[PDB]
Amino acid sequence: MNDRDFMRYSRQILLDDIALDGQQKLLDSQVLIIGLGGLGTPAALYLAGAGVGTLVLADDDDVHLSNLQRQILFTTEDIDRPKSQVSQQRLTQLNPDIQLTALQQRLTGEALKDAVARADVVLDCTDNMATRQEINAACVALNTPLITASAVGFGGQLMVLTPPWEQGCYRCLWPDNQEPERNCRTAGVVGPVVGVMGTLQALEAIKLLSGIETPAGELRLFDGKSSQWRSLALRRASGCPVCG
Amino acid sequence: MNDRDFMRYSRQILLDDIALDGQQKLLDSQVLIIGLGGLGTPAALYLAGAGVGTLVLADDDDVHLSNLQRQILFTTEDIDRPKSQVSQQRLTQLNPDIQLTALQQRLTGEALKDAVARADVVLDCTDNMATRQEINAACVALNTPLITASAVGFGGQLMVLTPPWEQGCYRCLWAGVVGPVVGVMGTLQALEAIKLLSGIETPAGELRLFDGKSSQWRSLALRRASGCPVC
Ligand SMILES: [Zn+2]
Numbered sequence: 001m002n003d004r005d006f007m008r009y010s011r012q013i014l015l016d017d018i019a020l021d022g023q024q025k026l027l028d029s030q031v032l033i034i035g036l037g038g039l040g041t042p043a044a045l046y047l048a049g050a051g052v053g054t055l056v057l058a059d060d061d062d063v064h065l066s067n068l069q070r071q072i073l074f075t076t077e078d079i080d081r082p083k084s085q086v087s088q089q090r091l092t093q094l095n096p097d098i099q100l101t102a103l104q105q106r107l108t109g110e111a112l113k114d115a116v117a118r119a120d121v122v123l124d125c126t127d128n129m130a131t132r133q134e135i136n137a138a139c140v141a142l143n144t145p146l147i148t149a150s151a152v153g154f155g156g157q158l159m160v161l162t163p164p165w166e167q168g169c170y171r172c173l174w175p176d177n178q179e180p181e182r183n184c185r186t187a188g189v190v191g192p193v194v195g196v197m198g199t200l201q202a203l204e205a206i207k208l209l210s211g212i213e214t215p216a217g218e219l220r221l222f223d224g225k226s227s228q229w230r231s232l233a234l235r236r237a238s239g240c241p242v243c244g
Numbered sequence: 245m246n247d248r249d250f251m252r253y254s255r256q257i258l259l260d261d262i263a264l265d266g267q268q269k270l271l272d273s274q275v276l277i278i279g280l281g282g283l284g285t286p287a288a289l290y291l292a293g294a295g296v297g298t299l300v301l302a303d304d305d306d307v308h309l310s311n312l313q314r315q316i317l318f319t320t321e322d323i324d325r326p327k328s329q330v331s332q333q334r335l336t337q338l339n340p341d342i343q344l345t346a347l348q349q350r351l352t353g354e355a356l357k358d359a360v361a362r363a364d365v366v367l368d369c370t371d372n373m374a375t376r377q378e379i380n381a382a383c384v385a386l387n388t389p390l391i392t393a394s395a396v397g398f399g400g401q402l403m404v405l406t407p408p409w410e411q412g413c414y415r416c417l418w419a420g421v422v423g424p425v426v427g428v429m430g431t432l433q434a435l436e437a438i439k440l441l442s443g444i445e446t447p448a449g450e451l452r453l454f455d456g457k458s459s460q461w462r463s464l465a466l467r468r469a470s471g472c473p474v475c
């Protein structure tokens with residue numbers, strides 16, 4: 001690569017586990033981020049700056065004042081402007097040497113499928129159970145990893161699902177499809193909490209793409225209130241509508 | 245608190261643990277963020293969007309290409325501009341309704357003690373063992389809570405030291421980095437500030453360590469050193 005790119009990616013390249021090799025891998029890698037909010041926003045911000053070759057940002061909503069408290073990528077001046085655009089645009093100003101696509105739609109059906117297909121890794125950053133479900137289905141089908149997370153109030157939840165599908169899919173831990181019983185406090189959310197969650201979704205994407213020994217198949221839980229971390233093991237359904 | 249304000253802070257206000265009581269508290273607080281790097285950058289960003297009344301951005305340095313990989317608050321286009329200025333400007337675009345004071349200088353001795361005094365919580369975001377040491381001194385002198393962090397390669401470190409100074413100060417205790425690893429640490433530094441300024445209970449007498457490769461946290465029990473030169 002370049003002698004400049006070296007400087008920019010200096011902090012990663014200088015790392016044994018990544019070095020020049022991985023750094024190229026990152027540059028040759030592609031990542032799909034469905035949803036650019038308090039979760040996908042810092043996810044995209046850190047991936048671009050890390051040098052992920054390609055980034056597809058999908059989000060069908062505009063920038064609202066209500067967002068600025070946790071969706072750090074945006075600015076008040078961006079209000080009413082479509083997220084995907086504003087996003088790609090600002091990420092560009094950060095890392096021009098990388099390609100950024102902006103889908104101003106809702107990824108579904110085949111539009112979501114092939115989109116998933118390509119991607120070497122797919123981050124789910126839609127705090128939506130339905131979407132998350134088909135993103136999972138699609139991911140399982142076109143054997144492409146899914147790194148899903150979420151947050152409500154002071155609580156965070158993260159999960160990495162690799163293609164081998166060892167410990168099953170999201171439709172294993174929740175063969176259902178409706179909603180969880182955390183539907184109560186679904187009122188607000190602390191920025192740092194949803195933030196740390198997305199940021200971690202990116203660390204997991206890097207490690208996955210740069211082929212690092214990152215444990216998966218867990219369900220990490222964060223309690224922003226007690227500032228305590230916790231992990232629940234996983235194992236697939238003895239006959240899931242997927243992963244079967 | 246008008247229509248606009250209710251709207252931006254709405255996801256925080258609709259929270260039992262904060263509501264108008266806390267949102268109001270945040271808006272009356274001042275936080276000193278010393279250092280605007282991989283740590284300070286996301287911290288300032290999350291605190292501002294949160295609505296902390298006054299933010300003092302300290303940092304005697306300019307943007308560099310190297311930076312852009314972990315310091316998410318800057319772009320290539322600010323490459324030679326000073327950070328405190330660039331931060332101050334970008335943060336205002338996010339929340340014009342809060343007090344944002346830049347500090348293109350380098351705090352030390354008195355210049356530091358003043359800033360620490362006029363500040364509810366101080367965030368040590370200077371990955372420099374030295375500045376760090378002076379701050380811990382100032383923070384204990386003016387019994388001002390100190391949230392400090394670190395992040396090297398794949399491992400981060402976090403600590404919340406408060407006034408009763410029960411389990412020690414930073415003395416009582418004592419070059420590549422992954423983007424997200426410093427981030428997590430910084431974002432968490434904000435989380436602790438918001439919990440401290442809003443009044444939420446937070447076990448703090450420990451040294452949280454994060455290993456971003458194995459993806460697991462560990463803690464060490466702090467202890468105020470016998471005859472510590474500050475405690
Ligand atoms: Zn399954």
Ligand SMILES: [Zn+2]
Pocket residue numbers: 412413414415416468469472473474475
């Ligand atoms: Zn001490």
